[PDB]
RNA sequence: AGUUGAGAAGCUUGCUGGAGGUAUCAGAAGUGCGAAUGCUGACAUGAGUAACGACAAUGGGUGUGAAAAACACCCACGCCGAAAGACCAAGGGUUCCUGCGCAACGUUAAUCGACGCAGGGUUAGUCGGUUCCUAAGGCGAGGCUGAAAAGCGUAGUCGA
RNA sequence: AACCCACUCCCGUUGAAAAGGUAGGGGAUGACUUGUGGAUCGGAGUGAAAGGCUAAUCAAGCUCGGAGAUAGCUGGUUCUC
RNA sequence: GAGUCGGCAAACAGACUUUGAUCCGGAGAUCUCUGAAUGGGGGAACCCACCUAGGAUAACCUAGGUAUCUUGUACUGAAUCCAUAGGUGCAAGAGGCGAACCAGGGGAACUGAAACAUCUAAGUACCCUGAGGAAAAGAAAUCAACCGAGAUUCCCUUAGUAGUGGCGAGCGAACGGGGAUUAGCCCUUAAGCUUCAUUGAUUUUAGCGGAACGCUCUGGAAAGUGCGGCCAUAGUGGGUGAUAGCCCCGUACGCGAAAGGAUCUUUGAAGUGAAAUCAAGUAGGACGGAGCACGAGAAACUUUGUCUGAACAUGGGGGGACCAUCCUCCAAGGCUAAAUACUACUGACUGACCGAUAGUGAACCAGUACCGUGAGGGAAAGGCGAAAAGAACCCCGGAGA
């Protein structure tokens, strides 16, 4: 959520967090190109989660 | 807010099957209601491809309009209009014949 | 365009009436020639095209006064 | 950037001409981003698969156009890159 | 049997293109008039 | 269909139709069509008539298939060969290739297709572009000229 | 001969073609033919001059406005007594 | 406040959450390349870059900047001794678009006159330039006859009248009455208008509650036939399987705002109005033109292209050639609300308006398809049922139609 990310999570702590779920976005774009992805809710979920951490890095 | 939620039990006014005591399963968005047990329909459906089957004639319920049912009272055992005459922290659905809150 | 830098005269239009009133258009241009005017404070000639009615005003008001309010309407001299 | 490595690759492109290509040779066909250069996908393979690649070729594909009622329809055009690796380290 | 239309693309864009119409003053009135009717194209 | 009035027209009923209708008397009219070489859709006569797009030419077999003069393979005849063959530039815009089909299209039939649906398919330091420089010509800071729009043009920067 | 042009006959005229075809013709190293790119426009251009050409339109294009131009001239003008 | 993942569109998958999930309003963050397009160029949605700081490995990346003009401002300094032009650096503003409205610049012809030149059409169409939510115009060198009226703008009369006119076609006032609206201030420096700081009111961008019915017939289905009763500051609304004040949404009424938006008003501030100082190349005059209803006409008056030229309140200029006598105003410097004109866009209503050859060109994926090198032109296209219950299964057929 967003109330978690406000809670004393600094610039570098959330700045490392973006490079974590870009991996999870990459691995879900590789499995979709191949034939193994049934959890289609996961694919449209990390798009709405990279957007949250980019918002809190402009409001302090 | 709306007179009829999902987990209610109703009776039917002015239909093919009037006076049938029922219970709401699914509410649609064009204020049509699928009441569990009444308004039965039968659909000639082809048996399904892609290693499925449907076979033949299978029943299900067809929805009816929201103006054709009403909240059942179980204290005069007849249909009763409902209202929101009582609200203190929430709009409580309350009957108008007896001024008693529904459950 | 044919305007003056002192008096503000543009060309106007009118007619060219004959002896049977055959109206046709013409332009009334103003007289204006180039001329150099000596100043003393900047001790140099300035050249600007003015009318013959602008020559009469320079001879009346003075050159330094008419150059001043030419600057004080925001123009190039 | 720290980003921009997790954007230029959109998956494999396995088909009849790419299956026989990766076996007789070592060339793997990806479906790269719509505007990427030959350097910034040389780096995103050495990073994301830990293999050394010698050289990369690319090409552009036009989208096929359908013609039904109520106008025409243009499918999305896309780029494509043949990644020619070393004779060892066939990738996954 | 030369017909009156022999096609090209370098001659079509330099005469009827957008940067040809937008350069002059009549052509910028051709753009606003053809836009305000509601045409999809504005540049043939 | 019957029946009543000098007439415009009115009235009662048989079937089809499946939800609106207007005594009476007054108003307000986009108020009555056969014709304007009238306008826009439908259907006739001509008429199952003329034509089926160069007078390079086709004849058997085997196959597939619901169905072969026209499709595939085979055998034999013909025709172009300074093109009816190959290749670059324009121009076009997926017509290229493979499965699946044949209602529509193709001046006939189609199992065939430049035709429908679904996949596939264009790899560059050197070949053409872009980058460098210019011809005719275009635009042109400042600058002159002009009712206003604007016109011409120096430095300059575009244009094979 | 390629190539550019259009002198004759016949066929065609609802053509294969809103200007061709099959046979014959004239020029063919030059007042030549042609590819790409540019310049000149509406009482205005171009023209070895015919009033010819300026997008199958030309004794002054095409399009939108003035404009429902003006017509002592043709054609039409609808239910009963 | 309990369902949800936009529409044509429709299935089968994967899912999210009792209170903030979709959903509705206020504020913010992101905002690719084109386009005034503005770092330089271009064939609009493309190419080539510099500079400053911060990182990064023979190949770069984040963050900014970099257009011309108009003003101002420091620095620099040609022929030339000085010092102007000129050249840099910075600050502020402008540029473009939009249907009509308003003021200016330029301005036709067809057609009327039963021909046609003056004249009409007409200062109309169109084309440029400005500015505003309105603009312009306005505070007497004005009109009236010896009576008096006191800024402008707009409607109704005077009146199709006096005049004007190849005295033809035609064009056409004023004086005086009736109404709408109601402020006059300054050049000794003013109201007023801007822009912030302010204290209250007024609404505005979302909502919430919201009265009263039963049995009985026919029918596929009752709102209808019957028989009764109730509500009312809500009774000719919509829609529910056929005709509903009382079934559903609404209506008459009542309440509603974290937050912005304005509109009146608070009392302060910074400004500005603003030109300095009662008006000189100004009034008037002479040829040449316009505007005045007024086509040189006995032609007054206002204007300006050329040429000239005064008096200084014992002055001046007006009262339709001109002159004497009377009356009435102070020209050559400025500022001003209201009544007024308009609708591309909004919302609420309303109709003796249309009902798919009508009404927008357009109820339908319409400025689309198509026709053009272009500017430009420009169509045809609605309806199953209350509800998809949209036809399982069998027989002929190419395994189709
Ligand atoms: Mg005239
Ligand atoms: Mg390449
Ligand atoms: Mg697209
Ligand atoms: Mg009805
Ligand atoms: Mg009629
Ligand atoms: Mg008829
Ligand atoms: Mg007749
Ligand atoms: Mg026929
Ligand atoms: Mg015959
Ligand atoms: Mg015969
Ligand atoms: Mg025959
Ligand atoms: Mg043939
Ligand atoms: Mg031979
Ligand atoms: Mg030969
Ligand atoms: Mg195709
Ligand atoms: Mg093929
Ligand atoms: Mg056929
Ligand atoms: Mg095909
Ligand atoms: Mg160059
Ligand atoms: Mg040049
Ligand atoms: Mg210039
Ligand atoms: Mg030039
Ligand atoms: Mg040739
Ligand atoms: Mg020859
Ligand atoms: Mg010879
Ligand atoms: Mg002749
Ligand atoms: Mg022609
Ligand atoms: Mg007219
Ligand atoms: Mg006519
Ligand atoms: Mg530029
Ligand atoms: Mg630029
Ligand atoms: Mg502007
Ligand atoms: Mg005439
Ligand atoms: Mg005339
Ligand atoms: Mg008349
Ligand atoms: Mg006449
Ligand atoms: Mg004003
Ligand atoms: Mg004023
Ligand atoms: Mg008096
Ligand atoms: Mg007064
Ligand atoms: Mg409510
Ligand atoms: Mg209610
Ligand atoms: Mg009703
Ligand atoms: Mg019905
Ligand atoms: Mg009702
Ligand atoms: Mg009921
Ligand atoms: Mg004065
Ligand atoms: Mg005078
Ligand atoms: Mg005077
Ligand atoms: Mg006088
Ligand atoms: Mg007098
Ligand atoms: Mg219509
Ligand atoms: Mg109909």
PDB file of C-alpha atoms in Angstrom, chain B:
ATOM      1  CA  UNK B   1     -29.739   3.188  -0.643  1.00  0.00           C
ATOM      2  CA  UNK B   2     -31.562   0.299  -2.346  1.00  0.00           C
ATOM      3  CA  UNK B   3     -34.501  -1.640  -1.038  1.00  0.00           C
ATOM      4  CA  UNK B   4     -33.152  -5.078  -1.986  1.00  0.00           C
ATOM      5  CA  UNK B   5     -29.676  -6.408  -1.187  1.00  0.00           C
ATOM      6  CA  UNK B   6     -28.360  -9.895  -2.053  1.00  0.00           C
ATOM      7  CA  UNK B   7     -29.073 -11.735   1.211  1.00  0.00           C
ATOM      8  CA  UNK B   8     -32.796 -11.008   1.421  1.00  0.00           C
ATOM      9  CA  UNK B   9     -35.893 -13.186   1.085  1.00  0.00           C
ATOM     10  CA  UNK B  10     -38.833 -11.890  -0.930  1.00  0.00           C
ATOM     11  CA  UNK B  11     -42.140 -12.749  -2.585  1.00  0.00           C
ATOM     12  CA  UNK B  12     -43.191 -12.149  -6.175  1.00  0.00           C
ATOM     13  CA  UNK B  13     -45.933  -9.745  -7.279  1.00  0.00           C
ATOM     14  CA  UNK B  14     -47.453  -9.651 -10.801  1.00  0.00           C
ATOM     15  CA  UNK B  15     -45.643 -12.346 -12.750  1.00  0.00           C
ATOM     16  CA  UNK B  16     -45.968 -15.832 -14.228  1.00  0.00           C
ATOM     17  CA  UNK B  17     -45.432 -17.179 -10.716  1.00  0.00           C
ATOM     18  CA  UNK B  18     -47.020 -14.750  -8.272  1.00  0.00           C
ATOM     19  CA  UNK B  19     -46.983 -15.303  -4.535  1.00  0.00           C
ATOM     20  CA  UNK B  20     -43.903 -17.529  -4.764  1.00  0.00           C
ATOM     21  CA  UNK B  21     -41.750 -17.116  -1.675  1.00  0.00           C
ATOM     22  CA  UNK B  22     -38.162 -16.778  -2.826  1.00  0.00           C
ATOM     23  CA  UNK B  23     -34.648 -15.564  -2.015  1.00  0.00           C
ATOM     24  CA  UNK B  24     -32.365 -13.292  -4.029  1.00  0.00           C
ATOM     25  CA  UNK B  25     -29.168 -14.765  -5.489  1.00  0.00           C
ATOM     26  CA  UNK B  26     -27.802 -12.153  -7.907  1.00  0.00           C
ATOM     27  CA  UNK B  27     -28.762  -8.536  -8.580  1.00  0.00           C
ATOM     28  CA  UNK B  28     -27.996  -7.127 -12.022  1.00  0.00           C
ATOM     29  CA  UNK B  29     -27.318  -3.517 -12.995  1.00  0.00           C
ATOM     30  CA  UNK B  30     -30.472  -2.899 -15.064  1.00  0.00           C
ATOM     31  CA  UNK B  31     -32.429  -3.519 -11.821  1.00  0.00           C
ATOM     32  CA  UNK B  32     -33.308  -7.082 -12.779  1.00  0.00           C
ATOM     33  CA  UNK B  33     -33.136  -9.792 -10.129  1.00  0.00           C
ATOM     34  CA  UNK B  34     -32.375 -13.510 -10.348  1.00  0.00           C
ATOM     35  CA  UNK B  35     -34.581 -14.998  -7.633  1.00  0.00           C
ATOM     36  CA  UNK B  36     -33.562 -18.475  -6.540  1.00  0.00           C
ATOM     37  CA  UNK B  37     -36.278 -21.016  -7.284  1.00  0.00           C
ATOM     38  CA  UNK B  38     -38.689 -19.151  -9.576  1.00  0.00           C
ATOM     39  CA  UNK B  39     -39.010 -18.072 -13.231  1.00  0.00           C
ATOM     40  CA  UNK B  40     -37.535 -21.215 -14.731  1.00  0.00           C
ATOM     41  CA  UNK B  41     -36.308 -21.252 -18.324  1.00  0.00           C
ATOM     42  CA  UNK B  42     -34.877 -24.015 -20.497  1.00  0.00           C
ATOM     43  CA  UNK B  43     -32.152 -23.574 -23.093  1.00  0.00           C
ATOM     44  CA  UNK B  44     -31.493 -25.881 -26.035  1.00  0.00           C
ATOM     45  CA  UNK B  45     -27.696 -25.805 -25.857  1.00  0.00           C
ATOM     46  CA  UNK B  46     -25.328 -27.697 -28.149  1.00  0.00           C
ATOM     47  CA  UNK B  47     -22.903 -30.081 -26.394  1.00  0.00           C
ATOM     48  CA  UNK B  48     -19.732 -28.150 -25.851  1.00  0.00           C
ATOM     49  CA  UNK B  49     -16.537 -28.506 -27.911  1.00  0.00           C
ATOM     50  CA  UNK B  50     -12.920 -28.460 -26.632  1.00  0.00           C
ATOM     51  CA  UNK B  51     -13.436 -31.760 -24.760  1.00  0.00           C
ATOM     52  CA  UNK B  52     -16.482 -30.457 -22.888  1.00  0.00           C
ATOM     53  CA  UNK B  53     -20.117 -31.436 -22.827  1.00  0.00           C
ATOM     54  CA  UNK B  54     -23.412 -29.708 -22.230  1.00  0.00           C
ATOM     55  CA  UNK B  55     -25.692 -32.341 -23.692  1.00  0.00           C
ATOM     56  CA  UNK B  56     -29.219 -31.054 -24.065  1.00  0.00           C
ATOM     57  CA  UNK B  57     -31.929 -29.126 -22.265  1.00  0.00           C
ATOM     58  CA  UNK B  58     -30.729 -27.588 -18.983  1.00  0.00           C
ATOM     59  CA  UNK B  59     -32.804 -25.340 -16.714  1.00  0.00           C
ATOM     60  CA  UNK B  60     -31.775 -22.034 -15.145  1.00  0.00           C
ATOM     61  CA  UNK B  61     -33.495 -18.921 -13.824  1.00  0.00           C
ATOM     62  CA  UNK B  62     -34.266 -15.814 -15.849  1.00  0.00           C
ATOM     63  CA  UNK B  63     -34.260 -12.445 -14.068  1.00  0.00           C
ATOM     64  CA  UNK B  64     -37.303 -10.293 -13.440  1.00  0.00           C
ATOM     65  CA  UNK B  65     -37.738  -6.589 -12.827  1.00  0.00           C
ATOM     66  CA  UNK B  66     -37.205  -5.035  -9.394  1.00  0.00           C
ATOM     67  CA  UNK B  67     -40.728  -3.570  -9.321  1.00  0.00           C
ATOM     68  CA  UNK B  68     -42.222  -7.071  -9.250  1.00  0.00           C
ATOM     69  CA  UNK B  69     -40.917  -8.243  -5.859  1.00  0.00           C
ATOM     70  CA  UNK B  70     -41.078  -6.831  -2.348  1.00  0.00           C
ATOM     71  CA  UNK B  71     -39.465  -7.477   1.023  1.00  0.00           C
ATOM     72  CA  UNK B  72     -41.392 -10.102   2.966  1.00  0.00           C
ATOM     73  CA  UNK B  73     -42.388  -9.229   6.499  1.00  0.00           C
ATOM     74  CA  UNK B  74     -42.916 -12.485   8.527  1.00  0.00           C
ATOM     75  CA  UNK B  75     -44.979 -10.621  11.153  1.00  0.00           C
ATOM     76  CA  UNK B  76     -48.088 -10.044   9.075  1.00  0.00           C
ATOM     77  CA  UNK B  77     -46.762 -12.585   6.502  1.00  0.00           C
ATOM     78  CA  UNK B  78     -47.416 -10.356   3.506  1.00  0.00           C
ATOM     79  CA  UNK B  79     -45.510  -7.972   1.274  1.00  0.00           C
ATOM     80  CA  UNK B  80     -44.478  -4.682   2.838  1.00  0.00           C
ATOM     81  CA  UNK B  81     -42.895  -1.502   1.549  1.00  0.00           C
ATOM     82  CA  UNK B  82     -39.622  -0.612   3.243  1.00  0.00           C
ATOM     83  CA  UNK B  83     -38.098   2.717   4.149  1.00  0.00           C
ATOM     84  CA  UNK B  84     -35.413   4.730   5.938  1.00  0.00           C
ATOM     85  CA  UNK B  85     -37.384   6.635   8.554  1.00  0.00           C
ATOM     86  CA  UNK B  86     -34.812   5.617  11.182  1.00  0.00           C
ATOM     87  CA  UNK B  87     -31.203   6.661  10.734  1.00  0.00           C
ATOM     88  CA  UNK B  88     -28.814   7.586  13.551  1.00  0.00           C
ATOM     89  CA  UNK B  89     -25.463   6.260  12.367  1.00  0.00           C
ATOM     90  CA  UNK B  90     -26.624   4.398   9.279  1.00  0.00           C
ATOM     91  CA  UNK B  91     -29.654   4.347   6.997  1.00  0.00           C
ATOM     92  CA  UNK B  92     -31.470   1.353   8.484  1.00  0.00           C
ATOM     93  CA  UNK B  93     -33.990  -0.424   6.271  1.00  0.00           C
ATOM     94  CA  UNK B  94     -37.222  -0.196   8.273  1.00  0.00           C
ATOM     95  CA  UNK B  95     -40.737  -1.285   7.316  1.00  0.00           C
ATOM     96  CA  UNK B  96     -43.418   1.358   6.932  1.00  0.00           C
ATOM     97  CA  UNK B  97     -46.384  -0.715   8.100  1.00  0.00           C
ATOM     98  CA  UNK B  98     -44.964  -1.333  11.592  1.00  0.00           C
ATOM     99  CA  UNK B  99     -41.799   0.877  11.794  1.00  0.00           C
ATOM    100  CA  UNK B 100     -39.585  -2.103  12.650  1.00  0.00           C
ATOM    101  CA  UNK B 101     -36.042  -2.689  11.324  1.00  0.00           C
ATOM    102  CA  UNK B 102     -35.447  -5.508   8.843  1.00  0.00           C
ATOM    103  CA  UNK B 103     -32.762  -8.135   9.415  1.00  0.00           C
TER     104      UNK B 103
END
